[PDB]
Every structure is written in C-alpha cells, then in structure tokens.
Design a protein around this ligand. Structure first.
Ligand SMILES: CCc1ccccc1CC(=O)N1CCC[C@H](C(N)=O)C1
Ligand SMILES: [Zn+2]
Length: 139
C-alpha cells in the first residue's frame, strides 16, 4: 500500500483505488496501473521532472529503503493477476530489488523528488509506475 500526495491530488495504484478515490476521480489509466483522485487538504510531496535512472525506494515487506538502478519508462509484459488480464503495462521501469505482493505504492525517489510508485515485481525484481511525465500534477 501507499500513495503520493501533491497539491490537491492523491496518486495511487489503480488496482488499489478505494470507493472514495473513484468518487473523486481526476484521471485513471489501466495500461499504467495509475489513478489520481482529488483531495480537500494540500499535499506536500514534490514530483521529480528529470531523467534519473538511480534512486531509492521504500520496500514495505522489509520496512526498509533500498537504492536501485532502474530502466527508462517502457511497455513491459505483465502476467495475469486477479486485477488484470495478461497485458503490456506502459510507463513501467524495472530494477533488481526485493518486492512481494503487498509492496505496491512504495515511493521511488531521486535527488529531484518523487519518481514513481511500486506497481509490479517478482523473482528479485521490482517495477515502478513512472509519474514524472504527469506535468499537470503541479498545477
Ligand atoms: C510488488 C508486486 C509483486 C511482487 C512480487 C510478486 C508479485 C507481485 C504482484 C504483481 O506484480 N502484480 C499484482 C498486482 C497488479 C500488478 C500490475 N501492475 O499489473 C501485478
Ligand atoms: Zn532525478
């Protein structure tokens, strides 16, 4: 579990969105596993606007942060789950690092701010849904 709080927006993994997130829907994209909802209180997370390929992510299944080198956002095949059929997930970045079911929503950050959130994983890998291209989050 986990979310990004920036301005009047809450960014979560689309498959973990609540009834409240859907009732205050701003934008969602199944192909990216992202959903953004509106908030009443101001959020103070800063979004990175960069092309960093190194950062640090929070791994809830270890209660620890880990440094990672990650690939540029791309279209990656993701096996079927209870949430989605087998499909290509876009704007996904892979890294070597621990992740297990339950870790989605952990924040990935570089020196510039929030890069994305955990969205996939498996066999010593972790995948992050990029949010750096969503320029409207800051307005
Ligand atoms: C960190 C998650 C994980 C780690 C290690 C093994 C398995 C998983 C679960 C997994 O990758 N998925 C289930 C939930 C929806 C995800 C999606 N974005 O399509 C895919
Ligand atoms: Zn950066």
């Amino acid at each position: 579990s986990g979310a990004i709080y920036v301005g009047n927006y809450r960014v979560v993994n689309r498959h973990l969105a609540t009834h409240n997130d859907w009732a205050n829907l701003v934008w969602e994209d199944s192909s990216r596993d992202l959903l953004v909802s509106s908030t009443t209180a101001q959020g103070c997370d800063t979004i990175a606007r960069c092309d960093c390929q190194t950062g640090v992510y929070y791994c809830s299944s270890r209660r620890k942060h880990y440094p990672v080198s990650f690939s540029k956002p791309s279209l990656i095949f993701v096996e079927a789950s209870e949430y989605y059929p087998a499909r290509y997930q876009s704007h996904l970045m892979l890294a070597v690092g621990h992740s297990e079911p339950g870790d989605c929503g952990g924040i990935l950050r570089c020196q510039h701010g929030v890069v994305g959130i955990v969205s996939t994983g498996g066999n010593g890998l972790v995948g992050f849904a990029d949010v750096r291209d969503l320029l409207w989050l800051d307005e």
